[PDB]
Amino acid sequence: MLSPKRTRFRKQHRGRMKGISYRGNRICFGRYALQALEPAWITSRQIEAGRRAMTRNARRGGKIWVRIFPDKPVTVRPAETRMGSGKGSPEYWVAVVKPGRILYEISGVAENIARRAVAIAASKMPIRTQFIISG
Amino acid sequence: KAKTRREDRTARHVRIRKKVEGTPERPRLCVFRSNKHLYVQVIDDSKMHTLASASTMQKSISEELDYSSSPTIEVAKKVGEVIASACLEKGITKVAFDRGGYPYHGRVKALADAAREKGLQF
Amino acid sequence: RLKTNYIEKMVPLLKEEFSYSNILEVPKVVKIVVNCGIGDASQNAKGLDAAINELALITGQRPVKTKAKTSIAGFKVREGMTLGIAVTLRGNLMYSFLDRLINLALPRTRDFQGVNPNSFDGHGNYSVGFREQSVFPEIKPEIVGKARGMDVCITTTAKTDKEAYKLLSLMGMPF
Amino acid sequence: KKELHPEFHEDAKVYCNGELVMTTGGTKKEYVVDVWSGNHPFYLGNRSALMVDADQVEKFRKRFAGLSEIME
RNA sequence: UUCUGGUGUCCUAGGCGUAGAGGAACCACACCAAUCCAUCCCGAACUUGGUGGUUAAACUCUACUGCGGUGACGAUACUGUAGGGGAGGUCCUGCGGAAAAAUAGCUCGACGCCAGG
RNA sequence: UGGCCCUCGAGUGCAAAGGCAGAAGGGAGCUUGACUGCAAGACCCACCCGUCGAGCAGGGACGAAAGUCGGCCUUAGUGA
């Protein structure tokens, strides 16, 4: 649930994944889609390894769309005790992937080719994913 | 295209003031002049109603020249006196000074002064 | 002459050319702001006084003392310094002054074409400009700093642009 | 005192014409050929490009057309 | 009853845009301006004395549902209390309350005191 | 400079929140309550302490007048 961002004064608290309330999108772009079931801290090394894989089995075809964006920073403690708050960029950054929201979107292709494409993309995701269609 | 909010004229001429609001509504004195005549009114307060309302034309009925000038300052004091007197007889002098747009010596300088001739004093 | 010509030839044609109706509601000049900016950047009070006492002759009216609007530019200009003047005449003082530029002053200027580009603002308003080589019955090239021009923005009561040039063309303004 | 009399100059206001004898008030060539006028800028001649497109119109007459050598 | 002016109770079902239309009985433009007064530059705006013309603009109405706004029923989210599950760190159940968004629809206000036709 | 769209998206002495165009915004004249002596009724603290405040008494300033002002938009700029 991340995408290329730009430099800024990014450095705030962590946050807290709440009820499914917020997330609850549908299927706008692309024919089929893929949703989640439980919130989490998706890093950039996960979305990138999942996006390229989505087109890795395609190569020169349709177009990929991302209706998501990270926000909630991620501070980690080196190895010492706890004197203050973490940095926020040691490893990476994440957000919140609550269920009901849409993630990947594929279209302009067949049903089978667009089916296996989401398969591998789902493996890259740490949280379980639900496969849908339309309607 | 895009709705724009602009404060009306009667919202920048410093019409409504503080203090006087000691009462639900201060006994203002509607002393406005049109583009030919002038209308005076001792509007009450609370909700509405007034004590006495006179005009430049109404005076012509009592005793005034027919095709006589109105914008003239001479008529100002005449319009301020006709509205007065009877206004006091209605009960008791309940008029204040309210006017936003007349540089002191405006066509209302005689209207307010006329009130000081019937009893209203401040 | 300029004012009189208005209600005896100017307005008439403005009644037949455009929509037929009453007498008024026709293109009529309201004022004439012949602003004469001064060379900015250079901090000098001489150029300021040389301007105020410059237009106060051709218009016979004490100029203005505009102040630099509060803003952040590239130059080292501050807010609170005077760098321009704009006088505007009305009534008789307007028509009379406007009649000057039309009759006199021009084509007094050597090599005066007259062909004006597009221009127009978009609401019945017209403006012109004079190079650093003009001439006016009031201006005296005997006791002045340096030859400097000025801007002349004439606004009318016209609703549209097509009703702007139609008021200055039949008036006498060079076109 | 220069600030005393603001100088109205009403004379030049109402009487803009006055006397053309003093200063030429549009007596010269406001907009007309001066003398000889021999100016040929880029805006003259080059602007109004005289179109020159001539072709062969079909006529009613017996004439053999075609060069000695044929070529596409 | 219709129209018009000043001041309120109510402040974007009452706002904005567009089109049409009315009055020199009322209101605005407008005429004049040596003055009281004003414009650090112009009486543009205030202001003062007032033929004529107009009511185009402005303003006050009417029509027209583009743009705003007002706003159900049902469902959903959340939650108090009393309990039960549970690997995503939340969720479910009995019960009470139950909006935001969105949909049908409503809608381009309605009146009060006084004065002048 | 002139015209149009001109709608806290500007300006507030300085951080920031809130608030403000009936303006403390901005400009000018007169002035200078950036008043003395008190002060019903309350807020804020364990206490000390802090804050707001109609009106009254003795005298002034501004406006025609009603009328305002006991500091500076408010909250720090301090210490028995």
Q: Which residues, other chains included, contact A46 with Cβ-Cβ below 8 Å and sequence gap of 6+?
A: A2, A124, A125, A126
In this complex, the answer to whether residue B72 has its CB under 7 A from any atom of chain E, a nucleic strand, is yes
Residue A102, beta-bridge partner list: A35
Q: What are phi and psi of C43, to 5 degrees?
A: -85, 95
Fill in the amino acid letter for C147: A
Experiment used for this model: cryo-EM
- Bases of chain E below 7 A from a protein C-beta are 5-9, 12, 15-17, 26-30, 32-33, 36-38, 40-44, 46-50, 53-57, 66-68, 77-79, 87-91, 112-117
DSSP 8-state class, residue C162: G
Mutation target to probe the C interface, by most C beta carbons within 10 A, among D9, D37, D47 is: D9
The HSE-up count of residue A62 (CA atoms within 13 Å, CB side) is: 21
Domain spans in chain A, listed from the N-terminal domain onward? 22-135
Which residue from B104, B111, B102, B63 is spatially nearest to B83, judged by alpha carbons? Answer: B111
Whole-number distance in Å between A75 CA and F45 C1': 40
DSSP 8-state class, residue C82: B
Q: Give the Cα separation of B84 and B48 in Å (integer).
A: 19
In this complex, the answer to whether residue B99 has its CB under 7 A from any atom of chain F, a nucleic strand, is yes
Residue B39, beta-bridge partner list: B32, B55
Q: Could you tell me if residue A100 is left (phi over 0), alpha (psi between -120 and 50 degrees) or otherwise beta?
A: left
Q: Which residues, other chains included, contact D68 with Cβ-Cβ below 8 Å and sequence gap of 6+?
A: none
Q: Give the Cα separation of A34 and A99 in Å (integer).
A: 10
Mutation target to probe the D interface, by most D beta carbons within 10 A, among C62, C96, C97 is: C96
Fill in the amino acid letter for D10: E
Q: Give the Cα separation of A8 and A10 in Å (integer).
A: 5
Determine contact, residues C108/D24, Cβ cutoff 8 Å. Answer: yes
Q: Give the Cα separation of B52 and B48 in Å (integer).
A: 13
Q: Which nucleotide is nearest to B110 (CA to C1')?
A: F64
Q: Give the Cα separation of C37 and C43 in Å (integer).
A: 14
Q: Does the beta carbon of D39 lie under 8 angstroms from any beta carbon of chain C?
A: no
Strand A32-36 and strand C150-156: pairing? unpaired
CA dist C101 → A94, C34, C94 (Å): 72, 11, 11
Helical H runs in chain B?
56-63, 73-82, 86-89, 109-115
Which residue from A114, A115, A113, A122 is spatially nearest to A51, judged by alpha carbons? Answer: A122
Q: Does the beta carbon of C108 lie under 8 angstroms from any beta carbon of chain D?
A: yes
Q: Does the beta carbon of D72 lie under 8 angstroms from any beta carbon of chain C?
A: no
Q: Count of CB atoms within 10 A of residue C165's CB?
A: 19
* Topology (CATH level 3) of domain A22-135: Aldehyde Oxidoreductase; domain 3 (3.90.1170)
Q: What angle do CA A94, A95, A97 make, to 5 degrees?
A: 125
Which residue from D12, D5, D18, D3 is spatially nearest to C59, judged by alpha carbons? Answer: D12
Give the burial class of C31: count Cβ atoms within 10 A of its Cβ; 0-12 exposed, 13-18 middle, 19 or more buried: middle
Nearest to D16 among C93, C99, C107 (CB): C99
Q: Hey, what domains does chain C have and what are their CATH numbers?
A: 1-175 (3.30.1440.10)
Whole-number distance in Å between D66 CA and E33 C1': 93
Cβ distance C103 to D2 less than 8 Å, yes or no, reads no
Resolution, given in Å to one decimal, reads 9.4
